[PDB]
Amino acid sequence: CTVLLQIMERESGNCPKDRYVVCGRVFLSLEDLSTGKYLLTFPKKKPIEHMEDLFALLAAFHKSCFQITSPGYALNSMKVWLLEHMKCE
Amino acid sequence: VGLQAALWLSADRLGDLALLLETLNGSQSGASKDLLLLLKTWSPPAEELDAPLTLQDAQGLKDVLLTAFAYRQGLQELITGNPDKALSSLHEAASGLCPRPVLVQVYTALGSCHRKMGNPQRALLYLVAALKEGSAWGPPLLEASRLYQQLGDTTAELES
């Protein structure tokens, strides 16, 4: 596959600036995947040190965004549950 | 232990309390005569696994212990003339449960620390926060009266 980044401006109601880029090309096969190389296979690839692997998980996954309001308390147990109960690095 | 300690911490038996918790953890923790570190070192031994119910559990009371001892330590050091040491423990108050009446009072307390040091513009911060979050904004306006007295803003003082 080859990759296209399309750009368009919003401000100008002329549709004037409809640039692109050809941003490279992705070669792939079972010989490559059979040796991992682009996969993420869990727990051995716990220590995330090529950030594309982090970026892959933040692209693939089902994102869900929330507000938490404690209006007659302050809210700090987060970090314990995160760090202690959930055990976050 | 939590409940016992609440009796001893309602009844000013802090020497016996720290002794109890020294016994609980390793007695190698013999020299940590500060409570505020022993209370944190004290680890509830489960997430309270499928046993009978409770109205409250070890952690939920530890969280009350730490905030209550911090508040008490703070007020004693403040009145005793250490509006330097207060600031540490009065930050440990807000960092852990602070029901908003506990925050209102922690903030008046920090206004008082800074006014006694001669830092009026910091004190004003904490006092405006206490005005906002509180339903009883007597003690902050009192602290403000005393601030404008310290300075000489007698019109501001009188209006406060």
Say yes or no for a CB contact (<8 Å) between A73 and B99: yes
User: DSSP letters of B63-95?
Assistant: HHHHHHHHHHHHHHHHHTT-TTTHHHHHHHHHS
CB proximity B124 to A under 8 Å: no
CB B107 within 8 A of CB B127: yes
- Partner residue facing A72 (CB), from B94, B95, B99: B99
**What experimental approach yielded this model?**
cryo-EM
**What's the N-to-C CA distance of chain B in angstroms?**
45
Task: Give A6's strand partners.
Answer: A20
Task: Give A21's strand partners.
Answer: A5
CB proximity B91 to A under 8 Å: no
CB proximity A29 to B under 8 Å: no
Amino acid at B31: A
What values do phi and psi take at B7, rounded to 5? Answer: -65, -50
DSSP percent split of chain B into helix, strand, coil, nearest 5: 70, 0, 30
Say yes or no for a CB contact (<8 Å) between B98 and A74: yes
Phi-psi region of A15 (alpha: psi -120 to 50; beta: other; left: phi over 0): left
Beta strands in chain A (DSSP E): 2-6, 20-25
